[PDB]
C-alpha cells in the first residue's frame, strides 16, 4: 500500500545528465528443444533514459504480438524491460533481438545463440515529453522480486492494476485509495519536474526524468529492518532519506533547497510514520496472503559448460537457472581461491516465469579445467553448491 510523496522545491548550476546504453540478452525461458513450445526472451537492462525500442526477429522478420514487462529500474536508477514471445524453436529457424536507444547511432542486433527477510518497494518513473502532452508516469510495486501492482498514466483508464494473484483479494477501497495516491503523485511529479527544470536553468524544450523509490525491509519475525525513500533526477541521486528516517542527504545545492523545504514541512516524520506503520503492516499482510509463492525459495539448477577459444585457453561457464528470489552469488575459484580478476558476470535475468537466470565465465589454460570450481550462494540452498567441469 502506497504513500503520498512530497514535491521537489522550486528555486544553482546547469545540471548534468547520465546516459547508459542498454545491455542486451537474448535467451529462452527453458533449455530449448526443437518441437517443444517455449518462450523467447530479450532482456534489456542498465539503460538511461527510458525511451527504448525493442523488436524480436524471426528469420530477420520482426515478430508481431511480442509482450513486455512494466518499466522498472535497478538501485543505480537504470531501467530494465523484458520482451518475450511464445515460440517453438527448430534447428535452422533464426531468432534475434533488435534494440534502438538514444545512445546508439544505428539499431543494435544480437542473435539467439543457443550455444528469511523480505522487502516491499514501489518504483516511480516520470518523464517529461515537451511538445507531446503531459509527462509519462509509470509506477510498479514489488514484494521481493515479485511485481504485484502497476499504474500507467497512458493506460486507457489509469488505475492501480493487480499483477499478482494474491493481491486480487483486496477490496475496492484498496484499489480506490491506491489509484488516488497514484493520480495525485502523477501531478506532484509534474510539479517536481517543473521546479527542477527551473533550478538548473533548463529549457522547457528538453525531456527530463524524475524517479522515486520507497519501501521497507522486514526480518523473518516481521520487524522493520530498515526503510528507504530516494529520489533521482536525470539518472543520478538527487535527495535521499537517511537510514535514521529523520534526516536527508542532498546531492547538490538545488537539492539542499528541497531539503530545507521538506525539513520545514516535516516530510521525514510523515515518511517515518508510513515506513514503520503502513509499509511493514501491509508487507506482512502480503507475505501471508501470498505465502505459497512469496515465502518459497527456488534453488538454482546448476551446470558448467566448456567453450574452447584457442589451443592454450578455454572458457568455463557456470550456469544457474530457475531460481527465486533473484539474489545470487556465482564465483569461480582456482584451487579454492576466488578469481575476482578474470571472471565475466552477466546481469541476473528473468526467465519470465517468476524465476531468474545467471551465468559466470572464466578463461582457463586448457588442460587445467579441473583446478577450477564454481561456487553458488543462494537463499534456497542450505549452504553453497560447488561444481566442477565434468
Ligand atoms: Cl538493483
UniProtKB/TrEMBL annotation:
Primary location recorded for the protein, binned into one broad class: membrane
GO biological process entries: antigen processing and presentation of peptide antigen via MHC class I; immune response
Keyword annotations: Disulfide bond, Glycoprotein, Immunity, Membrane, MHC I, Signal, Transmembrane, Transmembrane helix
The keyword Cell membrane is annotated on this UniProt entry: no
Gene Ontology CC annotation, any one: Golgi membrane
Domain Ig-like positions: 300-386
SS bonds (residue pairs): 216-279, 318-374
Domain of life: Eukaryota
Membrane topology term: Single-pass membrane protein
Subcellular location: Cell membrane
Family (UniProt): Belongs to the MHC class I family.
Name of the protein: MHC class I antigen
Amino acid at each position: 500500500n502506497r504513500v503520498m510523496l512530497p514535491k521537489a522545491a522550486g528555486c544553482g548550476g546547469g545540471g548534468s545528465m547520465i546516459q547508459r546504453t542498454p545491455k542486451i540478452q537474448v535467451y529462452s525461458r527453458h533449455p530449448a528443444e526443437n518441437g517443444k513450445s517455449n518462450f523467447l526472451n530479450c532482456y534489456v537492462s542498465g539503460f538511461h533514459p527510458s525511451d527504448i525500442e525493442v523488436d524480436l526477429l524471426k528469420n530477420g522478420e520482426r515478430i508481431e504480438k511480442v509482450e513486455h514487462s512494466d518499466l522498472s529500474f535497478s538501485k543505480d536508477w537504470s531501467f530494465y524491460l523484458l520482451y518475450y514471445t511464445e515460440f517453438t524453436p527448430t534447428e535452422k529457424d533464426e531468432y534475434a533481438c533488435r534494440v534502438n536507444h538514444v545512445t546508439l547511432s544505428q539499431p543494435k542486433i544480437v542473435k539467439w545463440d543457443r550455444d528469511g527477510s523480505h522487502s516491499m518497494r514501489y518504483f516511480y518513473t516520470s518523464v517529461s515529453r515537451p511538445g507531446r502532452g503531459e509527462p509519462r508516469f509509470i509506477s510498479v510495486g514489488y514484494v521481493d522480486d515479485t511485481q504485484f501492482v502497476r499504474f500507467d498514466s497512458d493506460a486507457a483508464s489509469p488505475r492501480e492494476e493487480p499483477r499478482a494473484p494474491w493481491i486480487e483479494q483486496e477490496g475496492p477501497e484498496y484499489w480506490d485509495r491506491n489509484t488516488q495516491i497514484c493520480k495525485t503523485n502523477t501531478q506532484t511529479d509534474r510539479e517536481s519536474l517543473r521546479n527542477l527544470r527551473g533550478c538548473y536553468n533548463q529549457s522547457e524544450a528538453g525531456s527530463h526524468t524524475w524517479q522515486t523509490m520507497y519501501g521497507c525491509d522486514v526480518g523473518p519475525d516481521g520487524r522493520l529492518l530498515r526503510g528507504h525513500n530516494q529520489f533521482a533526477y536525470d539518472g543520478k541521486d538527487y535527495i535521499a532519506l537517511n537510514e535514521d528516517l529523520s534526516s536527508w542527504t542532498a546531492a547538490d545545492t538545488a537539492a539542499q533547497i528541497t531539503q530545507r523545504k521538506w525539513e520545514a514541512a516535516r516530510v521525514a516524520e510523515q515518511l517515518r510514520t508510513y515506513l514503520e506503520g503502513t509499509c511493514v503492516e501491509w508487507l506482512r499482510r502480503y507475505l501471508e496472503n501470498g505465502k505459497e509463492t512469496l515465502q518459497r525459495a527456488d534453488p538454482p539448477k546448476t551446470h558448467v559448460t566448456h567453450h574452447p577459444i584457442s589451443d592454450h585457453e578455454a572458457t568455463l561457464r557456470c550456469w544457474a537457472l530457475g531460481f527465486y528470489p533473484a539474489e545470487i552469488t556465482l564465483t569461480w575459484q582456482r584451487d579454492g581461491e576466488d578469481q575476482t580478476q578474470d571472471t565475466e558476470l552477466v546481469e541476473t535475468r528473468p526467465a519470465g516465469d517468476r524465476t531468474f537466470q545467471k551465468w559466470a565465465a572464466v578463461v582457463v589454460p586448457s588442460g587445467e579445467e579441473q583446478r577450477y570450481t564454481c561456487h553458488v550462494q543462494h537463499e534456497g540452498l542450505p549452504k553453497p553448491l560447488t561444481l566442477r567441469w565434468e
